[PDB]
Structure 1
């Protein structure tokens, strides 16, 4: 007593937009640092009948019947996760149920501190995430600044974490958790130093490695598991899994953290797990462990280094003047243009990126940079040679943005008036589309 007509027949309107989105993805140079492209395997899971199952609780401890095959899938995923991050199942545990990054972070922070509990995080403008306690003079923007008492550390003018400032802050403020690992930070993290500062004040060390997870997994960057009490990460970014998250807890450093994190996830915050998610996370995590994915991750850094170099060679400024990882923040001050304007120009040419703050920025609307990253294009097979091309397109986009601002003015609505029908943008898009459309596409 249902409809079994395929998507195209049952809902032609929606199937079109999806066909449209697929063509756009295929024909874009994707520089969103947090995006990737899932293979057909990960997507077969996400679309599996396994999402029919209610299975609140944990494997063997379910509030529903007929959860035998679900328990195997949840158990395999936890196994493959601890595998992927080269941690022993005796020392470290993992919750695979959090639905996304922001959920995982809120659940983990609460497990550790509770309501009114004290937390420390890097400021959004300096490269911190919303869920790291972000607030503004006007409003408590994130729940992490509201259900928790939070204080925010800004990086120095050069754009690097100021470890001195972190300690100064930790000593007077006396937090129970300090968050490190970031959303738009282009440098590696001295976890050892964070561990030192947390030991001094008896605070938990929280590392959110969502942006850099693959590096940590493949031993290319610093390992937070050596020092951290809690490690969280999303599965959809550099990891190239589905949209989901993981919470890792150090059992050895903190006995009875296992129960705290698990009860924070359920039943404190969530109800029934998304089994298609967990199934997909399991599938991707097998690929994470292979030396083949290590190759991909290395290529990401190789492309990121090269792209940084090519942009500097074209007199484009970078925050910290380079990158240790997959991402770069371009400081657009010398061009007197905003990230918002550059995002529009790039969207007009099929270049996906996002506006990003810089250390000097005081206002989150009207920001002075864009952020870029290599994981997506690296997935499509682009090598270091290709990075000069991406740099060239970004350069030309910056120039067109300068010209269009000259003609139409500083207002964004005024600025957009210039984009349709622009002869250079059309030639540039044609260039982008031509090259993008040819690349391997999962």
Structure 2
């Protein structure tokens, strides 16, 4: 029917479905959404423009849109224990931009986690609007432990006097002490924003402490560990802040929201409020720990910080291949996607890096367990140690295909 009209597009979508089936996805930001989240996004709510907020719309015909957006807001509030939520940001970048716009002025100093240790692009990369508009100053982990050192972060905050401190990371494997971050913010009179995008599903699942009681404002993506549609979310307990956030999102940065994506956010948040989501989060944690253990045991690989207590970890591969870029290329030859990744105090260039980052959420959402996870990391050790032996990669490829065959994506 509708696909006969555009075979080039619809065939490419079948190819991507098959590609996702035959791939072992370890990119730590990826997940596998439910059928219901996809269907929500494919509905006729896309036809209706909803500029404004529930009960305060520009346009009539919005009573039902209002029920759907209210459901998203109420479920975010319930799941994360916050008194206000805004479900309109189109992305995590828009969510973060709305928060800077609400709490600080162009030119103010912001402290964020060093891009080599886990900081996101929107936490002050010079190539980001973040870096261009505000004065970002980065904090790092300790050189020797590779852990956050809250005394060192406090001593830097006293020198730099930020207006806003950002906590959260895309490559930190350990539990963040949000209460200490709020104590640091308090000691220098800064706001604390936490970007929980990478860990939000473990926060919902109960496996990572919540930032919501400690941060002035919490942002997140609805995708990644929370396993929702791609989009943003902002949370706060402060009603004056909530009103600034609302105006910064619309009409400050966006026009009307994507109400079909907001319906998919409502669906994903009810999935996360279900008891099975806690089990999901336990398996994320155990799968990641099983893979990190293979690299820990092995003499030629070091895990940054020695391990993980979340969904991901970094590995210094440089004793085995030249750089993380090479490691990423080799593993792509066996149907395993991950990303090269700077390690703390990274010596090589950003385009090479000394490391890979590995995450467990996608394989976990396909039903894989600890045994599979250990096996995948054993395959990665093999392929990297044998990168210039085409015979070997070929056999690992065939092994990988038996595994993917056994854990159907959908």
- Shared fold (TM-score, shorter chain, > 0.5): yes
Q: Does 1:223 align with 2:207?
A: no
Q: Distance in 1 between matches of 2:265 and 2:105?
A: 28
After TM superposition, list the pairs within 5 Å mapping 1:241-320 onto structure 2: 241-251=228-238, 255-315=239-299, 316-320=301-305
Q: Distance in 1 between matches of 2:78 and 2:227?
A: 16
Contact kept in structure 1, 2:110 and 2:134, CA below 8 Å: yes
Q: Distance in 1 between matches of 2:27 and 2:67?
A: 35
Corresponding residue SS for 2:61: coil
Q: Distance in 1 between matches of 2:21 and 2:316?
A: 28
Q: 2:339 aligns with which of 354, 358, 365?
A: 354
Cα drift, residue 35 of structure 1? 0.3
> After superposition, what is the alpha-carbon deviation per residue over 1:385-439, rounded to whole angstroms, capped at 9, x for unaligned?
11221111111121123x36xxxxxxxxxxxxxxxxx322222111112211220
Cα drift, residue 107 of structure 1? 1.2
Structure 2 equivalent of residue 322 of structure 1: 307
RMSD: 1.3
Deviates more, 1:72-81 or 1:117-126: 117-126
Q: Distance in 1 between matches of 2:355 and 2:225?
A: 21
Deviates more, 1:14-23 or 1:359-368: 359-368
Structure 2 equivalent of residue 23 of structure 1: 18
Q: Distance in 2 between matches of 1:299 and 1:206?
A: 28
Deviates more, 1:282-291 or 1:102-111: 102-111
Q: Does 1:127 align with 2:127?
A: no
Deviates more, 1:274-283 or 1:163-172: 163-172
Q: Distance in 2 between matches of 1:270 and 1:326?
A: 32
Q: Does 1:202 align with 2:189?
A: yes
After TM superposition, list the pairs within 5 Å mapping 1:65-76 onto structure 2: 65-76=60-71
Q: Which contiguous aligned blocks of 4+ residues in structure 1 show a shift greater than 3 angstroms?
A: none
Structure 2 equivalent of residue 413 of structure 1: none
After TM superposition, list the pairs within 5 Å mapping 1:34-53 onto structure 2: 34-53=29-48
Contact kept in structure 2, 1:28 and 1:437, CA below 8 Å: no
Structure 1 equivalent of residue 149 of structure 2: 162
Q: Structure 2: state its 5+ residue gaps.
A: none
Structure 1 equivalent of residue 328 of structure 2: 343
Q: Distance in 1 between matches of 2:164 and 2:122?
A: 13
Cα drift, residue 336 of structure 1? 4.4
Cα drift, residue 86 of structure 1? 3.1
Q: 2:2 aligns with which of 1, 6, 11?
A: 6
Contact kept in structure 2, 1:45 and 1:276, CA below 8 Å: yes
Corresponding residue SS for 1:334: coil
Cα drift, residue 101 of structure 1? 0.9
Q: Distance in 1 between matches of 2:304 and 2:322?
A: 16
Structure 1 equivalent of residue 370 of structure 2: 384
Contact kept in structure 2, 1:37 and 1:376, CA below 8 Å: yes
Corresponding residue SS for 1:225: coil
Corresponding residue SS for 1:97: coil
Q: 1:235 aligns with which of 211, 222, 235?
A: 222
Q: Does 1:58 align with 2:49?
A: no
Q: Distance in 1 between matches of 2:364 and 2:88?
A: 29
> After superposition, what is the alpha-carbon deviation per residue over 1:166-194, rounded to whole angstroms, capped at 9, x for unaligned?
11221121111101111111111011111
Give the TM-score of the pair, scaled to structure 1.
0.90
Contact kept in structure 2, 1:191 and 1:224, CA below 8 Å: yes
Structure 2 equivalent of residue 364 of structure 1: 350
Cα drift, residue 313 of structure 1? 2.2
Deviates more, 1:431-440 or 1:192-201: 431-440
Contact kept in structure 1, 2:88 and 2:233, CA below 8 Å: yes
Q: Structure 1: state its 5+ residue gaps.
A: 135-139, 405-421
Q: Distance in 2 between matches of 1:191 and 1:314?
A: 33
> After superposition, what is the alpha-carbon deviation per residue over 1:254-284, rounded to whole angstroms, capped at 9, x for unaligned?
x410111111101110001001110000001
Contact kept in structure 2, 1:86 and 1:217, CA below 8 Å: no
Structure 2 equivalent of residue 111 of structure 1: 102
Give the TM-score of the pair, scaled to structure 2.
0.96
Contact kept in structure 2, 1:303 and 1:387, CA below 8 Å: yes
Contact kept in structure 2, 1:27 and 1:434, CA below 8 Å: no
